[PDB]
Amino acid sequence: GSHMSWVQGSFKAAGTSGLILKRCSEPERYCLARLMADALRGCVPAFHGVVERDGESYLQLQDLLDGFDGPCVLDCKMGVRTYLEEELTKARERPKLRKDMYKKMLAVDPEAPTEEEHAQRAVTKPRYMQWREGISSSTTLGFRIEGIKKADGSCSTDFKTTRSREQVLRVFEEFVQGDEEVLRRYLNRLQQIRDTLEVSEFFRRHEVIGSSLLFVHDHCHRAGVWLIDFGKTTPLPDGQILDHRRPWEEGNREDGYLLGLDNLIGILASLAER
């Protein structure tokens, strides 16, 4: 019925029922305006424009939870790559050694850092993001589960080493809790999303990094999926286009978004036959 209802750091309650405010960023704002006129219009939350809240700009979005009765939510980070190629450029010309990310890496695996990273107590952003891709399913399957918010109020972000196809299947199995109608509805929606992406003018002309698919369902068997988070989705130069399936290699700007979606549909289709 509301995301802000579950909250109780980039979101704020809107004044209008059914909406939510997201801290406005230029890349995301650009993206949402273009998407409202794209094939993908229905695959993303409604973008109603910008509002100032305490001398501060917010995107006015559809709250995707508004139609659900006690929503279960799963955030699935899409792509084989989760950072812009410019992060590699910045990390070589002028590294901003991130002590925070060394610490976050240390927590998951104190042995992961190199001799020199240990000595710096700091890693580069790209190295941290590449490590996170490789110990999750991101690198091999082209997506990863980031978190779940349940109908019993229980939330979990404990998926950093969820990597095998079967490990990911078991998360979706637990998430859908035997609801065949929810799983069929998710699969019908993902098939239609994949069809829409494959014809989208926006999708062919944009490097889609850092975006998620948000799975939402309730005990009344309502089920929806939307693309969210266009903060790192960037227009390709001139008339360049991506296939969104081929492997990333610095300079080709490939995201493996549709490799992710192909695998995701594959795993849900497997689960539906179990």
Ligand SMILES: O=P(O)(O)OC[C@H]1O[C@@H](OP(=O)(O)O)[C@H](O)[C@@H](OP(=O)(O)O)[C@@H]1OP(=O)(O)O
């Ligand atoms: O937050 P989501 O989209 O799930 O994931 C993207 C974000 O992942 C975070 O890592 P963990 O998920 O392991 O905590 C990074 O610290 C954060 O980066 P910074 O630390 O802010 O530089 C990055 O974000 P970005 O800045 O939007 O690229």
Ligand SMILES: Nc1ncnc2c1ncn2[C@@H]1O[C@H](COP(=O)(O)OP(=O)(O)O)[C@@H](O)[C@H]1O
């Ligand atoms: N339009 C929306 N309606 C409802 N919940 C949303 C919406 N957008 C995001 N969320 C929730 O907020 C979380 C983070 O959203 P996201 O766009 O990735 O923010 P960020 O840019 O801070 O990473 C999602 O995983 C989901 O739980």
Ligand SMILES: [Mn+2]
């Ligand atoms: Mn995000």
Ligand SMILES: [Mn+2]
């Ligand atoms: Mn973001």
